[PDB]
């Protein structure tokens with residue numbers, strides 16, 4: 001009877017989920033609202049996380065403490081990093097990582113600022129397990145959960161469903177050269193602001209996790225934000241959750 | 249039972265002195281986060297080892313709220329100098345903290361390259377909801393009475409100045425001096441570290457008084473490399489500070 005936890009950051013990324021639940025009960029603690037109900041007769045909790053790494057981690061931790069979910073699906077919209085992808089495509093996160101984590105080597109003021117010399121700062125993803133330090137350079141999507149989403153690709157009719165790497169940061173990048181550099185360096189499919197943070201907390205609690213992100217925008221093709229993509233993503237996720245539930 | 253003071257540090261060196269100060273301890277670990285529950289001057293205190301960075305800090309703080317319901321939060325530890333007036337061993341009391349790592353940029357085509365001077369602070373990362381209604385935050389103010397108390401205790405600190413300042417939190421360790429200078433000039437930062445504003449965000453959501461207290465363990469503005477002894481010194485000051493609050497309870 002442990003629920004599926006489904007997350008979205010903004011109201012537009014959760015309202016379609018909420019509408020799908022039967023016998024809803026709403027809970028708000030701190031800044032974070034949860035709707036507890038059923039899908040196909042099975043317990044599901046929808047979480048509106050708010051935006052960014054701190055919010056995502058708090059909302060995920062609070063859900064672990066309150067609901068003890070059996071798996072977490074983090075979803076919502078993202079911006080394209082891979083030129084092959086277009087608005088409406090859905091990325092299933094083979095892995096996510098904190099793309100915004102940076103360490104730089106000492107340079108005197110005369111040398112100016114050069115972000116291309118910044119290194120990914122992996123300590124931000126380091127955890128402890130039974131008190132012992134465990135390094136992480138990324139968080140893998142649960143591979144069975146990833147595979148399931150890919151196997152359901154043809155049920156999504158508003159773009160392609162592809163595996164990719166999700167770069168999480170407290171950033172919205174619109175400098176195309178920066179997007180290109182991040183893609184070349186980290187092989188990112190897309191950027192957003194929550195996935196690796198929720199994933200970090202899921203790893204700490206040893207709960208299976210998958211990130212599912214629709215491209216609502218990509219400055220690589222001049223495609224501006226389309227809020228309807230967030231609805232289409234939730235529709236896919238409802239179908240996906242119901243498939244999991246059929247198998248329970 | 250009395251609601252505890254919650255005292256946080258990210259790394260072992262930032263909490264071992266606090267933990268040694270508690271009486272009648274028990275140690276609790278959930279997920280990746282360890283807590284020591286005991287007493288200082290007979291009053292309940294929980295010491296939290298948060299691990300490093302914004303996600304860890306927020307998780308550790310949230311878990312503490314759920315498990316322990318503290319009456320106030322002191323987030324402490326070490327930091328790197330951004331203000332050239334400050335040196336290793338000086339302590340900054342956070343008049344405010346903010347997510348210095350949060351960046352938004354306007355559209356530029358590839359040929360214009362990358363320009364971080366055009367990456368603006370992205371305030372949505374600090375936006376919260378209060379009873380379901382959106383509340384914007386461009387920073388989190390340290391509880392002003394807590395901040396004031398720390399400043400009033402300045403001459404009890406034996407190893408440097410105690411000053412008010414702005415704490416810039418980011419999942420970053422900057423050693424490009426031109427970038428440190430740019431951050432200082434843009435945001436009036438005293439120091440940088442990796443947790444404060446994230447713990448502050450959670451404390452604001454829960455409406456629990458919060459103060460950040462950071463010692464400079466390093467500053468590349470003066471060629472001063474990391475000294476771990478500063479972390480011990482900071483904890484000593486924090487214990488004195490906590491005992492003063494407790495006397496007032």
Ligand SMILES: C[C@H]1O[C@@H](n2cnc3c(N)ncnc32)[C@H](O)[C@@H]1O
Nearest residue numbers: 009051077078079171172191192193
């Ligand atoms: C503001 C909300 O929008 C998502 N989001 C959608 N597109 C982007 C993008 N190009 N860059 C960063 N975040 C994005 C964030 O993950 C966040 O939750």
Ligand SMILES: C[C@H]1O[C@@H](n2cnc3c(N)ncnc32)[C@H](O)[C@@H]1O
Nearest residue numbers: 258300326327328420421440441442
């Ligand atoms: C790695 C630990 O060290 C702290 N810390 C100490 N000095 C710095 C600095 N110059 N920059 C960023 N973080 C620093 C972080 O807050 C983190 O917890």
